[PDB]
Amino acid sequence: DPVQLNLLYVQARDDILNGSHPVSFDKACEFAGFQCQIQFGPHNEQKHKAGFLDLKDFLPKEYVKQKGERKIFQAHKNCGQMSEIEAKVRYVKLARSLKTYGVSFFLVKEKMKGKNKLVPRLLGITKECVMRVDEKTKEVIQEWSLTNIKRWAASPKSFTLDFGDYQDGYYSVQTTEGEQIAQLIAGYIDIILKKKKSMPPLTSAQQALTGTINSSMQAVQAAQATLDDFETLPPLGQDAASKAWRKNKMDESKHEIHSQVDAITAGTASVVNLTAGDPAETDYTAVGCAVTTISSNLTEMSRGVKLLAALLEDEGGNGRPLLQAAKGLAGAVSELLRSAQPASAEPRQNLLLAAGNVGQASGELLQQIGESDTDPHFQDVLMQLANAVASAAAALVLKAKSVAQRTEDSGLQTQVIAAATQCALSTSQLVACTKVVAPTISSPVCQEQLVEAGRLVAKAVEGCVSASQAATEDGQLLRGVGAAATAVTQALNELLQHVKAHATGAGPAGRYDQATDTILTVTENIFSSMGDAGEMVRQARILAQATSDLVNAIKADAEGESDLENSRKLLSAAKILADATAKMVEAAKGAAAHPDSEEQQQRLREAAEGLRMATNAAAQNAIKKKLVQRLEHAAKQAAASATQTIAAAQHAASAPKASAGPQPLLVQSCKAVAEQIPLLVQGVRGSQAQPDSPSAQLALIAASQSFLQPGGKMVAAAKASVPTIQDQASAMQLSQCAKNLGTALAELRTAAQKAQEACGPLEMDSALSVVQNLEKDLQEIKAAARDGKLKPLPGETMEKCTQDLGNSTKAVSSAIAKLLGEIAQGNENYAGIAARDVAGGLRSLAQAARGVAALTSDPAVQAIVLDTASDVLDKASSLIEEAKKASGHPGDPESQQRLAQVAKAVTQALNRCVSCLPGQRDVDNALRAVGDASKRLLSDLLPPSTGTFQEAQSRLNEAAAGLNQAATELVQASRGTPQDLARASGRFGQDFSTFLEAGVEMAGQAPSQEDRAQVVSNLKGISMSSSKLLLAAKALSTDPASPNLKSQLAAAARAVTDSINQLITMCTQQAPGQKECDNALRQLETVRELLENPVQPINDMSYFGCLDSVMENSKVLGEAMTGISQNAKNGNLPEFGDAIATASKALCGFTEAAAQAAYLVGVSDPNSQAGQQGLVEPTQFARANQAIQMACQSLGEPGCTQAQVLSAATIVAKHTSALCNSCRLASARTANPTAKRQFVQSAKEVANSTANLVKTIKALDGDFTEENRAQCRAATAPLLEAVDNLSAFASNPEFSSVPAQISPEGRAAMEPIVISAKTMLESAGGLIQTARALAVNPRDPPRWSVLAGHSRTVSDSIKKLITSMRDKAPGQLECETAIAALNSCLRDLDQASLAAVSQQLAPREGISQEALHTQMLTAVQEISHLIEPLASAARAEASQLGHKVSQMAQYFEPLTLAAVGAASKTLSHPQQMALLDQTKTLAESALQLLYTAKEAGGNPKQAAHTQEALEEAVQMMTEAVEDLTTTLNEAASAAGVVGGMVDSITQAINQLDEGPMGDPEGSFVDYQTTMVRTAKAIAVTVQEMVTKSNTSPEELGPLANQLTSDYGRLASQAKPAAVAAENEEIGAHIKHRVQELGHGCSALVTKAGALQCSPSDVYTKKELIECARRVSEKVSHVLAALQAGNRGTQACITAASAVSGIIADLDTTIMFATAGTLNREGAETFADHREGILKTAKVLVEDTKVLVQNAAGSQEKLAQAAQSSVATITRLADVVKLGAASLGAEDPETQVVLINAVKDVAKALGDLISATKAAAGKVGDDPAVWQLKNSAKVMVTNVTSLLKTVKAVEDEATKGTRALEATTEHIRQELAVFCSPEPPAKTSTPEDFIRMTKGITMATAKAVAAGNSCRQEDVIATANLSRRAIADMLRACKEAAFHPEVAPDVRLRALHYGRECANGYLELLDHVLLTLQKPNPDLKQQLTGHSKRVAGSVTELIQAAEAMK
């Protein structure tokens, strides 16, 4: 039956056509062809064209718009004319052919694995299969059987399905129809199952709190026990330095106990605050954090007080009271922790009583210590204020109780009663927290706790107000309102008193306390607002008022005082103030007169500084002192926070005791800061004790600035350790301490900077006094030595004293080099810094010398070390004196020469002081033996005896073997006792004497004089290398454990054996033919000794690099061993020798590569850490130096031949070029600005001397003039002096290195390479000896057998070493481990999401959601910090790669845990799914990055595609991290909590201050404009925050988040702008102002968060308003500092924005005039406005030409140019609006064309402004200036168009002419805009495209109509309308062009179509102009054809716009 077949065809056609069956384009085309065969019959070639075949019912509606109609037509022509029933059967057969037929299909948006994006996938459901299906190919991309599904999951937004068995991971896809998908697949699964035939009960959070508190109480008891015993102290003696040690340790212990009692009081306050909530609501882990803070700081306090008690009991004072106080505190703490236990059922009053007891106990303890400076009057005030608040709250409770008595309704009454009880409870809690916090009120964290209690009590008061309002409008409501007002006012008074005592300068105030403070603040503002005339002059005027008031007051007080002399002095001070104010006012007037002249602004700033200086003398120097006390408060807070962080880190890292992870790095940083703290405390105390001593203030500033760096490192390490720590309470405590340390460090930066400007320059007068005090102290040490009682300080061991003495001498020499460099740069204050560094190094040297004297027992040793140290100190005192005399007055060559002589003297003294140390011995004796032997070689070489030339030559060869032996003995002894190396050095000296005796014998015994030159040169070289070797041995002697010194010694041994080889190759005759084998074996021995101990790299080239080098050198060794074997077979001497030499060079290269590979494998072990490799590579530096001295010595010898002269010149050029390169790299690598400056200066000086020497030697090449040779000799010296200055400077131990610390298992994995290479070297030495024998005897069987054996042993060792190198391959085992870990985290997240679908996820009850989000955000921050270095390692090196992958894994596990928690807590299912999905995206992107990094593996040979995969993985990871960070930040800012906002701002400040500098990409101007944009954005954000505070306070959150992210953007670009500015003062100012604004923003955001959490508080709103005012002032200051950039111009940005505002005004006028609102006023004519326009336009073109001529030059003239240009354009716009008014609204199109003309003129001026900005002070031939003139031409064209338009719009005769030509000009510039490819800001959708295309159709219809009409009215109307339409169309098309989601092909097609349309309309416009000109009736008829081409262009534009979406 064919009917059923037709019905099957019907169903198939229905399914395919309607779109309910997934089918791709092609098989749809064949099904359409079958449709043609059925219902259109056989195809006819020409009858089946396009246009008639309706496609809607003929192809699937989803694919009809594919518009491949032609393809369909030839498919039809192909289908044939064959019968139709077979068409039906083929239709049904092809229907059943597809896998996609007969089953349901759903479009479900799927998330691609790795991105936060979505792609539709047509999921299908089958009786047998579940298959994903791509939308565009409609073919199965992946398949799943039903029988494997276990639990699907339906949600109204998503449908998640699982498999478990097949693929680890589940199927997540979101869709609106999840419910029916799930129920449908449920039924299909059911049929497959059918087919088979057969509160005393504590919560877990409370349990964890109980555990933490029990452990803490155990620690409290075990710390209470240790108190009873005085600890001990090491014997110290009455040494003056030891007395200072005792006092310093006493002071440090006092400060430390103060910090921990601060921490204990804050912890108890926090316990009170947190436990106040209802149970089952408290943040229990925060309570645990508080108890751990208490107990940890208690144990450290017990240690501190034991030490302090011992130190006191040495003095008369008794330690029993202090022990009693500490034991009382410990008992109070133990009782509190007894009360805080959740299981206890005591009333809350017990806990509050315990907290009060802790407060009083800590107060008593602080009284005993002698540190509670907080005056007892202030504690009295606090207590009476808190009691006043309690009384007022009691009164409010009375009123509330009365109201509850009056009211009647049940339920309401209990609400009122509950509110009253809450008020009473919260005020009692506030009183008790005040009791707790009173003794330790300086600590900010205590104050935060107390303001938290205050916020709680205010919230309860507002609750009481609401409860009163529940009543009914009685006078009792008025009384309740009154009671609330007193309670809030009383709380504010306590909070205000509180904040006042937060930062109190001191007890006494002084008589000018307030006036001086105000002038300080206003001068600070004047300094801050550099480069802004208005702010400067306003601040100058307010300053003048304040200081005039101060002068009046001081004059009145001078009248009051009675003594004639004192009154005269005070009146003179008043006179000085008045004079300074008069000069400042004059400077301000001058600045205001010429606002944009930087000279006047500099004069005003200098006048303000002079006023400050006068004030410091007019009164007691309060301003300097005031800034000093602010710094002291900041430094005390920083030290206290550092101690708290150290305590937290120690307590947290003890439990896991993991040698991996970030704890060991944290421990090293903690130790560094713990040795840095006492210096800060000592400086603070020195400044506290001496207020008027400038040296103490400078020492304090220096101590704080030094503390800044290690503090930042601890902060970073602590932030990195938090996610790893398993103890949540310890983790939170460490996190809080890290945040507080960061804040304190930022404020320390700001305060230290402020003081450094405050205190004058160091003047290098303090350094002289410091070295003088060192001399006097050392004299007293000498006196004590004469007493025979000089004792060692407790920490000093004689070996450590030696090491520190060596380091101090090197640092002193480096700082002397700095000082000479700075003086040579001329009269610098940096010379003061250099003098300070010299003095510091000298203090360290004196300390080490005293220690060395104390440890040693011989009186003569003590006397001699004291003598040499005092000599060093006095020589350096003379050096400092000469430095002062030099920096006083520049321009004196005698100054530089005398400074050089004194530096030489002090360096010699330093070397004596090192050598004077009797520990190292016989190194000086051996060095002197070398020197004396060299000098006896030096002169009159004449052979004393001929002897036997050849036999004594053999003797010389034996002496060479002996010298090699002795050098190998040195390099071996370098791993033994210092006595071993000393005796080895002596033996080497004796052997060198023997060898040089043989050398001097053959010096004269050689007949020819050419050989005499050879021997003398080679002997000088050998002597110099030996001297360097002995100096390296000396360096080892003074410091035995350092591995860099050991590697230097091995390198020196290599150099000496190399020089031996050079001498034997050159001078000794080649007659034996075996000397090259001798040199071979020498090098073999030396390089084996290099191989023996791989702990530092002897090379830079990395692991896979050294594998490549091993491959290459194994190839060379193979070819050379074949060569030597065959040449021994053939007995050919010269090539045999050459092949042996090549084999030996290959062996040496191989052993260098294997040593480096061993070192790399050792470092790559997880436990081991690497080092920073120092600045200048030591071995290369030494080689370059020695080459330079050798070349200059070659130039030094009198007989100058051309060959040697040119060789020396080339060698010097090459080596000094490499040296300057190294200096530049070092200056680009270091962080000390002085280091950068001096490295650059040294590079400049060495380059200058190199150029001088090169020019002199080029004047010498080919001339040989004796006077020219003398000139060369004279110029030789400065190069050596410069390279010596560089060697001295770059020897600073700070630059040197940090030895890599190798794990023991690291050495275990290191050994195999060393073993195999040692065996190979032994085999190769044997082979060399056998080959020498073969050279002796031509043939012998056993010898050839052993030669083959040695060659095969070499080969086997090579193969084994290669096997080990390839099999280890560091960085691909821990990558596998990390990948497994990340996949486990993926499974955990996927299972959590699956649980969360069907609503089974259990919200953990312990911790608050905010803390979970903070946990997630810290983990995300760490992963974000790690991403980039992981990529960098995956590109270059392997060891760092392994470390990075391990770190990323350890961070990715706790992030998963916290994400599960925070998703569980959230209730809104879409939000929790968002968190789970973004976290899963981050995990997936990390997994992909680890895959691609294990692929690349740090192999530079990796394919380009793997590098591309790595880069795209990194970009995916960065995107995922930023997406998750934004989700978390927004979700945390929706709630009022502000945490991670102030954290991010302080972190951004810190990141701004530190980091790497490189002079980055980009100029200054682009950074300036972007960052001025950001500054404007933050200013308008804070203003919006101000308005939203009053209006609607729930909008404070998102605004705060926006402000924090904007400040992060501002501070990310601040450092590159700072380092890119043409002057460093400018960049410094920008950095300082950005940091100060950071402080302001942190404060403002804290206030905004507080207000959003307490919306109705009258006072926090106030403080928010003043914080916003302050941050607005800071934004004004940073904008002003950005205006100080001459390059470009801030005037250009302001001009661009002003003309943009003008354009906005003109567009508004377009709107008004088009609406017809713009009407005539009176009888205003148009002609007068026309002359106005003409004048203004001529002035505008003059402004344009003056701008183009002024574009290159100072900022001033360009500023007037731009300002005048903007003034002229706005005046022109105003007169244009007036003229448009004069034209009346009756003809709006004329006004529209006028405004469009002036508006495009404004656009041209804006483009001209941008062009002028891009070309400021450039060369004449830069492309920017050509672009500028192009812009000027465009501006001229536009203004001429305006001129002609007005000139002939006076009359209507030429309306159409001008309108039409203006329109064609504007379309021409539109197509010109298309000529330049740039992306439009917006990207529009095709709906606007259809709109604009319909507009074009209407415009062209009206164009044809107007052309027919030839009437000016419709012509100008068409001109305007079509101009706007076409311009807007092209704008939207370009918006769609650079839009990434639009494919490049269709964007190009759309550009083609738009260009065609624009052209066609342009020729249409020229044709309408032709139609207007001549009557042209045929041309008017032709316009129709132009319209037809326009319509075709419109059609293709419709196609292009419809194509995309």
Side-chain angles (χ1 to χ4, degrees), residues 450-479:
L450 193 152
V451 300
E452 185 43 62
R455 187 260 286 173
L456 216 53
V457 76
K459 178 176 73 66
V461 161
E462 301 279 0
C464 275
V465 163
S466 177
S468 296
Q469 298 301 88
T472 174
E473 287 89 6
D474 198 353
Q476 53 203 0
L477 277 71
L478 175 52
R479 273 87 169 102

Side-chain angles (χ1 to χ4, degrees), residues 1453-1464:
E1453 190 277 331
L1455 174 142
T1456 293
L1457 186 48
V1460 166
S1464 193

Side-chain angles (χ1 to χ4, degrees), residues 1972-1995:
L1972 155 118
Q1973 285 151 223
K1974 285 92 48 254
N1976 279 161
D1978 21 72
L1979 268 79
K1980 188 221 67 59
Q1981 145 243 291
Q1982 274 146 239
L1983 242 357
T1984 65
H1986 291 327
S1987 76
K1988 284 182 278 188
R1989 277 85 66 191
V1990 164
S1993 296
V1994 173
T1995 313

Side-chain angles (χ1 to χ4, degrees), residues 340-360:
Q341 197 152 320
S344 85
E346 290 182 354
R348 186 90 190 293
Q349 185 36 56
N350 295 115
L351 164 66
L352 279 300
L353 178 57
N357 301 338
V358 162
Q360 179 188 355

Side-chain angles (χ1 to χ4, degrees), residues 100-198 200-409:
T100 79
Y101 180 88
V103 288
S104 55
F105 271 86
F106 305 138
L107 180 143
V108 288
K109 303 289 291 300
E110 186 149 299
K111 149 194 180 49
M112 65 183 73
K113 290 201 310 168
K115 299 268 274 181
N116 299 126
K117 275 178 66 180
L118 292 169
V119 294
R121 295 275 208 270
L122 281 83
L123 200 155
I125 301 299
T126 302
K127 194 33 52 183
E128 294 294 328
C129 286
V130 163
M131 61 165 38
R132 184 176 44 209
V133 175
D134 172 60
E135 60 92 9
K136 213 177 293 185
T137 62
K138 305 280 197 78
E139 53 85 19
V140 57
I141 178 173
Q142 205 269 339
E143 201 285 299
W144 285 311
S145 174
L146 272 299
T147 197
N148 302 98
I149 321 300
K150 65 178 72 66
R151 65 182 181 179
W152 47 103
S155 165
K157 288 286 304 306
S158 313
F159 166 75
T160 300
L161 188 153
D162 62 352
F163 319 82
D165 56 348
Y166 285 173
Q167 189 274 330
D168 51 353
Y170 317 131
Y171 198 43
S172 180
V173 59
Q174 78 255 27
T175 178
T176 52
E177 69 172 8
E179 271 78 49
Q180 59 252 36
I181 297 169
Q183 63 85 59
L184 187 153
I185 190 167
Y188 279 49
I189 243 284
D190 292 330
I191 299 289
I192 277 118
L193 307 166
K194 278 159 210 204
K195 275 149 160 190
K196 305 184 164 182
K197 283 170 187 190
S198 58
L202 296 195
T203 61
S204 182
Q206 292 178 355
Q207 214 63 26
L209 179 64
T210 300
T212 50
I213 191 167
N214 272 323
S215 162
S216 277
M217 211 185 318
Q218 179 76 40
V220 168
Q221 293 178 357
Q224 185 171 0
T226 62
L227 279 161
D228 69 332
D229 169 64
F230 304 73
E231 186 83 80
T232 50
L233 73 164
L236 76 165
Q238 209 76 358
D239 179 5
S242 195
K243 269 188 278 196
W245 178 98
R246 176 160 43 209
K247 172 197 38 165
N248 279 21
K249 181 69 80 180
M250 183 177 176
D251 280 9
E252 155 187 296
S253 291
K254 277 183 194 290
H255 183 267
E256 172 175 304
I257 305 148
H258 186 40
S259 300
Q260 289 100 25
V261 298
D262 275 15
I264 292 153
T265 55
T268 51
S270 174
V271 175
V272 173
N273 298 332
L274 291 162
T275 49
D278 198 76
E281 203 269 351
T282 79
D283 190 356
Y284 267 114
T285 68
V287 179
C289 180
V291 307
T292 50
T293 310
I294 295 165
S295 78
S296 176
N297 284 279
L298 174 47
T299 69
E300 266 78 8
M301 180 267 271
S302 79
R303 286 203 299 100
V305 298
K306 282 176 64 172
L307 167 60
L308 178 51
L311 287 165
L312 262 176
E313 275 274 321
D314 294 356
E315 278 74 343
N318 44 1
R320 296 323 309 188
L322 194 154
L323 270 300
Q324 282 305 322
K327 287 162 75 172
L329 180 46
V333 175
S334 76
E335 202 285 350
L336 186 151
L337 303 176
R338 186 179 296 276
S339 50
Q341 197 152 320
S344 85
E346 290 182 354
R348 186 90 190 293
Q349 185 36 56
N350 295 115
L351 164 66
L352 279 300
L353 178 57
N357 301 338
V358 162
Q360 179 188 355
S362 64
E364 288 157 33
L365 174 66
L366 284 176
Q367 292 306 79
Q368 287 301 325
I369 299 307
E371 200 70 8
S372 171
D373 174 70
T374 294
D375 194 78
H377 181 219
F378 175 71
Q379 317 172 21
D380 291 331
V381 169
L382 277 179
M383 282 325 294
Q384 63 93 29
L385 275 169
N387 279 328
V389 169
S391 80
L396 188 153
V397 167
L398 268 294
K399 319 279 198 208
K401 291 294 270 284
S402 83
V403 176
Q405 293 291 82
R406 179 46 53 219
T407 187
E408 297 152 347
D409 181 61

Side-chain angles (χ1 to χ4, degrees), residues 1399-1739:
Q1399 314 286 123
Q1400 289 89 15
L1401 184 57
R1404 55 168 75 169
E1405 290 281 285
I1407 191 167
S1408 67
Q1409 200 171 187
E1410 188 272 331
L1412 288 179
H1413 286 178
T1414 302
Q1415 273 184 21
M1416 293 177 70
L1417 194 151
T1418 49
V1420 167
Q1421 282 187 353
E1422 303 309 324
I1423 285 162
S1424 175
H1425 287 313
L1426 270 184
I1427 294 171
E1428 186 271 350
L1430 181 41
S1432 284
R1435 290 207 275 270
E1437 78 264 21
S1439 51
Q1440 307 286 88
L1441 179 148
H1443 284 164
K1444 296 333 191 199
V1445 302
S1446 177
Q1447 279 182 48
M1448 191 155 307
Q1450 65 182 357
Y1451 288 136
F1452 265 97
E1453 190 277 331
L1455 174 142
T1456 293
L1457 186 48
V1460 166
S1464 193
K1465 289 280 287 310
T1466 317
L1467 188 153
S1468 168
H1469 182 89
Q1471 190 78 6
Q1472 72 163 264
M1473 282 286 197
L1475 266 179
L1476 279 157
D1477 282 335
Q1478 300 204 15
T1479 293
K1480 180 171 166 67
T1481 291
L1482 187 46
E1484 283 175 352
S1485 81
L1487 171 59
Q1488 167 73 33
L1489 184 143
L1490 289 193
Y1491 277 153
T1492 184
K1494 173 180 192 291
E1495 212 76 20
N1499 195 357
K1501 294 318 178 46
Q1502 282 321 130
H1505 89 277
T1506 308
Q1507 191 263 329
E1508 185 260 335
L1510 177 77
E1511 181 60 29
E1512 58 87 17
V1514 163
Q1515 290 299 111
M1516 294 182 22
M1517 272 272 276
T1518 297
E1519 277 177 5
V1521 174
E1522 174 73 359
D1523 186 74
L1524 184 47
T1525 299
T1526 61
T1527 287
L1528 283 177
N1529 272 124
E1530 293 281 17
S1533 191
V1537 64
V1538 60
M1541 271 185 228
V1542 64
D1543 184 8
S1544 285
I1545 296 163
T1546 61
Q1547 177 180 289
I1549 287 164
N1550 280 319
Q1551 282 306 124
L1552 161 61
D1553 193 22
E1554 62 87 9
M1557 311 75 78
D1559 207 30
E1561 74 270 12
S1563 66
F1564 182 36
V1565 189
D1566 54 355
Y1567 272 125
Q1568 176 175 326
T1569 176
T1570 48
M1571 171 174 67
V1572 159
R1573 184 180 296 115
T1574 299
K1576 296 270 196 62
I1578 68 177
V1580 307
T1581 305
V1582 307
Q1583 203 62 36
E1584 187 169 303
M1585 195 180 309
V1586 174
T1587 75
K1588 289 308 181 197
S1589 74
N1590 315 316
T1591 296
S1592 61
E1594 70 270 15
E1595 298 274 357
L1596 291 159
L1599 297 177
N1601 182 13
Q1602 205 281 341
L1603 172 57
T1604 61
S1605 67
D1606 264 339
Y1607 183 69
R1609 274 192 272 275
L1610 183 74
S1612 75
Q1613 319 157 15
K1615 29 172 183 174
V1619 299
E1622 53 264 15
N1623 186 15
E1624 190 57 28
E1625 189 262 345
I1626 301 299
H1629 269 244
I1630 316 174
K1631 270 173 73 176
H1632 300 332
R1633 295 315 106 82
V1634 170
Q1635 284 174 147
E1636 277 157 58
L1637 161 71
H1639 302 323
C1641 286
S1642 58
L1644 166 79
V1645 180
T1646 304
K1647 277 323 183 303
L1651 179 54
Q1652 177 189 9
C1653 274
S1654 303
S1656 74
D1657 181 87
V1658 176
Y1659 301 131
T1660 63
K1661 189 180 69 86
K1662 208 168 301 175
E1663 283 310 318
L1664 161 66
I1665 285 166
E1666 287 88 7
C1667 291
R1669 167 190 94 72
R1670 267 168 163 80
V1671 308
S1672 189
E1673 189 163 2
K1674 306 294 186 289
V1675 171
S1676 171
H1677 293 340
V1678 61
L1679 270 178
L1682 283 195
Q1683 183 174 3
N1686 186 355
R1687 199 195 290 175
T1689 314
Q1690 187 71 358
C1692 281
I1693 295 91
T1694 61
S1697 191
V1699 310
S1700 189
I1702 287 298
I1703 280 177
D1705 199 314
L1706 275 297
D1707 288 298
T1708 54
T1709 59
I1710 297 169
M1711 285 268 288
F1712 278 83
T1714 298
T1717 317
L1718 182 163
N1719 259 326
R1720 188 184 269 242
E1721 294 310 293
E1724 50 202 14
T1725 70
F1726 181 50
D1728 49 359
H1729 302 162
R1730 293 177 63 257
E1731 293 84 4
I1733 301 299
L1734 303 180
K1735 299 155 206 140
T1736 50
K1738 269 76 173 177
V1739 176

